[PDB]
Design a protein around this ligand. Structure first.
Ligand SMILES: [Cl-]
Ligand SMILES: [Cl-]
Ligand SMILES: [Cl-]
Ligand SMILES: [Cl-]
Ligand SMILES: [Mg+2]
Ligand SMILES: [Mg+2]
Lengths: 278, 278
């Protein structure tokens, strides 16, 4: 079940925007799919890009600069929204760090959030079913990456589902949302005051508890204003000490949190995935 | 005299957004400048990108995908707004083809447009004076390009200032605004019912009247919905016959009017200008 909002040719391929009625989210949902030239010949491998706080599918679609290299490498690029949307969906209106645009890629258990805030189930189950049903996508070759809250999303999803994803990378991820300023309150609202339930939604906690994934690429800007209190990639370096998990963590002078940083290193990430997708 | 709105590192260069008080437009005005890594060591050539209807500096800055090749080629990229701005600037509110976002790179003579709508003088005199003052730019090496109304802007400006610019290109330009549905009413409102005054602001008319410039690159999508009524690049082909003006007109299957088309062919245009900027 799917509505076509827009279709535009870019680098020989097709960048589309689509909407559907989500059952897991009880919402009409909008997402973007870029289909490369090669898809006419064969179903192509999928990279799932998960966006950060306040974003929709549009921020990366417009600014990520992924189509040139996705076209070259023959990659399908899927960009979901970041929360449920709609009049019925509850929100925290005066906090951009909570509610709409702020689903934290988890399955909410607390009221009122529980009804619509099922982003973990949406990204891992419902939307992949819809993509396979409707697009020229090889569902046996899927990878996942994202920005910030999206990097949190990408990494926790990979660690919890290692056999579903060939590779994982991130741009400025929240690697330890359980103790990060902008994510701790959200976790408490969505999941409750008892911090034990949070461990399946924290990349570091998941590693601590024995979850594994082959390796990760993480790019991080040194001038990123969120680095010290919000991001703290070193905590992930600490968590993986003594494990088999590979980490290629690159810290970049002068680069910040924005799409100017993301777009700069986008080709590296697309190649990273294409190589590991097989 | 300039204000810094934003600075962001992208491909080793700096994408900035700035504002100033414009004397020519009696407006507070915002523009974008990308400074490539080459400017760390030496003055760089400047490409001016003029945007189309409804745009600000933002559309191309976010979606044009020029920074990767601009950084590589060592090009300063300046992206002005498309009209005067402010709460007391006259407009046709719901007409996206007139007033705000629709200055047509002309100096208006008719009331009430006369007061603020001096986009030709802004782009050719005032803003270049500011750019040379505040940036490590080699003003002896300047080129100009644009999209649609901005293609009309770049082309008419080049034709009237052949010694100022080394090269000129356009994405889906309005080559003959005097007989196009979306531009003909604007010319009449800004310049008067007497079509004689429109000739200085029509690429085809300028050529007919003896204006020259070495050559133009024009990219045009075949699936562009404005092709037959608003664009008609074949009219410029006709105008340059028996003249010394060169034209490389490329017509692309499946491509439309959007930034998906513009970004696909951006590298070609940047290389075109870099070549001729020496
Ligand atoms: Cl975030
Ligand atoms: Cl930042
Ligand atoms: Cl236009
Ligand atoms: Cl179109
Ligand atoms: Mg909120
Ligand atoms: Mg208007």
């Amino acid at each position: 079940g799917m509505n076509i909002i827009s279709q535009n040719t870019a680098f020989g391929g097709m960048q589309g925007v689509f909407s559907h009625q989500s059952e897991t989210l009880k919402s009409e949902m909008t997402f973007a799919v870029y289909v490369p030239p090669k898809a006419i010949h064969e179903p192509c491998p999928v990279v799932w890009y998960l966006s950060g706080l306040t974003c929709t599918h549009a921020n990366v679609m417009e600014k990520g600069e992924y189509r040139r290299m996705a076209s070259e490498l023959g990659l399908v690029v899927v960009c979901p929204d970041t929360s449920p949307r709609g009049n019925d969906v509850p929100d925290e209106l005066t906090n951009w760090q909570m509610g709409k645009g702020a689903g934290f890629y988890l399955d909410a258990t607390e009221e009122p959030w529980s009804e619509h805030y099922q982003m973990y189930s949406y990204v891992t189950e419902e939307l992949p079913a819809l993509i396979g049903q409707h697009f020229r996508a090889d569902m046996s070759r899927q990878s996942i990456f994202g920005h910030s809250m999206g990097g949190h999303g990408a990494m926790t999803i990979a660690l919890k589902n290692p056999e579903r994803f060939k590779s994982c990378s991130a741009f400025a991820p929240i690697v330890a949302p359980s103790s990060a300023d902008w994510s701790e309150p959200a976790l408490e609202k969505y999941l409750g005051a008892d911090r034990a339930a949070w461990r399946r939604y924290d990349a570091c906690s998941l590693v601590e508890d024995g979850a594994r994934f082959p390796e990760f690429l993480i790019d991080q800007g040194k001038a990123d204003s969120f680095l010290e209190k919000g991001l703290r990639p070193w905590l992930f370096e600490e968590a993986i000490k003594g494990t088999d998990i590979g980490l290629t963590l690159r810290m970049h002078d002068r680069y910040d949190h924005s799409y100017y940083f993301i777009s700069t290193f986008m080709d590296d990430h697309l190649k990273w995935h294409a190589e590991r997708l097989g």
